[PDB]
């Protein structure tokens, strides 16, 4: 998870191929609510076929899953059992001699 | 040509290129078990009806049958319920509750289990880390009936 978050911290933005959010003319708003965004999106989708299922953003390698000490010591302290273990040393005590 | 050839009616038929093939592809289509033919024919009927509606010397006659996204939406929603025996459900039983991830920390974490396998952090291996599937105590008394539907519509695609 730490390696993934470091890798995600490298992949943390659209480093290449930003959105082509060019703005055309401010159309003469005699009517309507200047909702140009939907028409622009429909036009660009029709003209470019952005979903042609071939292009990719590829802002990072999708590889090079580096691993390192750097975060391993976040082991900190384990919430282990056997902090008190009298039951389990009595478990050994059953086999103190070879019996059973 | 395939949409036309069987209608002997002289007035041609077409869609118009403001259609969103992408918005059909998932939101309109879900699991639907082919026979999309049924969809397109259901639309073609309804579009023809409004054409013959205006044909009664109404304000104008566009001289072609023109399909529209609204009739596709109506058609697909009908196709999910005319098959009334079907156990399934539409994708959008949710309104005003669009995944308000800032309303609390827990809402700020439901998105983890969907955003990750959406591959936005990585094209995951599909073969290592166990999935962070959620087992929701949530708000124990009431909420849950809504909760899953709310996220499912707004950051996912079916229910
Ligand atoms: N946090 C909330 N904010 C707003 N409305 C809520 C909230 N929690 C519950 N509701 C109301 O109740 C509905 C969702 O909770 P509901 O009472 O239906 O759950 P439930 O039947 O107890 O759930 P379960 O499926 O676990 O039995 C919402 O549609 C809304 O009317
Ligand atoms: Mg309930």
| CA dist., res. B70 & res. A82, Å (int) | 66
Which residues, at least 6 apart from A50, have a Cβ–Cβ distance to it below 8 Å?
A: A44
Does B108 contact ligand 1 (Cβ within 6 A)? no
Here the tokens at position B10 are 């002289």
Helix (H) or strand (E) holding B5: none
> Which ligand has the nearest atom to the CA of B137?
1
Burial label for B66, CB within 10 Å (0-12, 13-18, 19+), is: middle
Which residues, at least 6 apart from A25, have a Cβ–Cβ distance to it below 8 Å?
A: none
Here the tokens at position A32 are 């309507």
Residue at token pair 């059992």? A81
| CA dist., res. B44 & res. B65, Å (int) | 8
Asked if the C-beta of B121 comes within 8 angstroms of chain A's C-beta atoms, the answer is yes
| CA dist., res. B158 & res. B30, Å (int) | 7
| CA dist., res. B22 & res. B148, Å (int) | 25
Cα B28 to ligand 1 centre (Å): 27
Q: Are B124 and B116 in contact (CB under 8 A)?
A: yes
Helix (H) or strand (E) holding B128: none
Does B146 contact ligand 1 (Cβ within 6 A)? yes
| CA dist., res. A9 & res. A71, Å (int) | 14
Kindly determine whether residue A11 and residue B121, on different chains, have CB atoms separated by under 8 Å: yes
Q: Could you tell me where the DSSP H helices lie in B9-142? A: 21-23, 36-54, 69-82, 107-110, 112-115
Here the tokens at position A90 are 């009595």
Which residues, at least 6 apart from B113, have a Cβ–Cβ distance to it below 8 Å?
A: B131, B132, B133, B134
Q: What is the resolution of this structure in A?
A: 4.7
Phi and psi at B4, nearest 5°, equal -90, -50
Cα B105 to ligand 2 centre (Å): 22
Asked if the C-beta of A51 comes within 8 angstroms of chain B's C-beta atoms, the answer is yes
Q: Are A7 and A65 in contact (CB under 8 A)?
A: yes
CB atoms within 10 A of CB B152: 19
């Amino acid at each position: 998870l730490k390696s993934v978050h470091r890798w995600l911290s490298a992949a943390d933005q659209s480093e290449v191929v930003p959105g082509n959010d060019n703005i055309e003319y401010f159309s003469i708003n005699e009517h309507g609510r200047r909702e140009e965004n939907r028409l622009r999106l429909k036009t660009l989708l029709q003209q470019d076929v952005v979903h042609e299922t071939k292009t990719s953003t590829s802002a990072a390698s999708e590889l090079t899953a580096v691993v390192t000490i750097n975060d391993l010591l976040e082991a900190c302290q384990e919430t282990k059992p056997s902090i008190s273990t009298s039951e389990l040393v009595k478990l050994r005590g059953i086999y103190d001699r070879f019996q059973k | 040509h395939e949409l036309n050839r069987d209608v002997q009616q002289k007035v041609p038929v077409s869609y118009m290129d403001n259609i969103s093939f992408s918005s059909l592809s998932s939101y309109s289509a879900g699991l639907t078990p082919l026979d999309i033919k049924s969809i397109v024919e259901t639309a073609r009927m309804t579009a023809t009806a409004r054409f013959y509606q205006e044909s009664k010397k109404c304000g104008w006659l566009p001289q072609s049958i023109l399909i529209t996204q609204e009739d596709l939406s109506k058609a697909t929603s009908k196709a999910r319920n005319e098959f009334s025996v079907s156990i399934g459900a539409p994708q959008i039983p949710n309104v005003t509750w669009d995944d308000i991830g800032g309303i609390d920390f827990v809402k700020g974490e439901i998105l983890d289990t969907i955003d990750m396998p959406l591959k936005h952090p990585e094209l995951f291996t599909s073969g290592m880390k166990k999935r962070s599937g959620i087992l929701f105590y949530g708000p124990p008394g009431t909420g849950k009936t809504l909760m899953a539907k709310a996220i499912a519509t707004n950051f996912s695609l079916n229910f």
